[PDB]
Please model this.
Amino acid sequence: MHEKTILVVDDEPRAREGMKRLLEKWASGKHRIITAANGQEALDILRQERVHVLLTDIRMPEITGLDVLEEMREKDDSPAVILISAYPDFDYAQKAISLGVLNYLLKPVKKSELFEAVEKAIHVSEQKERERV
Ligand SMILES: [Mg+2]
Model:
């Protein structure tokens, strides 16, 4: 009951683990924070386990965060997606819009905006868990 799995993907170790640490005290043990170091690790985790919220960097070698998304729009319980990037890139944002991202946060993320996005994402997750009837 109640406990959601949040996957944070970033190819920079300090950004990845820092964000993990931020979310881990924001969750206060109520949720499960996990991390991946790149797009292939994230895809591996996404295919083997329920992820409710996906928080991912966009620019990663070989497989971008947008690439990851296009593999999940092709699946059943696709997670709610927050993208993150150091780049205010309109092309990424436009593609992200077209793929249904919930938030595009810029680095470094203000923990105010980051907590806000995850809460909306956790909420959006419950909304489509109830459409099994
Ligand atoms: Mg990166």
Observations:
- The beta strands are 5-9, 32-36, 53-57, 80-85, 103-106.
- The CA atoms of residues 13 and 37 lie 7 Å apart.
- The radius of gyration is 14 Å.
- Residues 11-12, 57, 59-60 surround magnesium ion (CB under 6 Å).
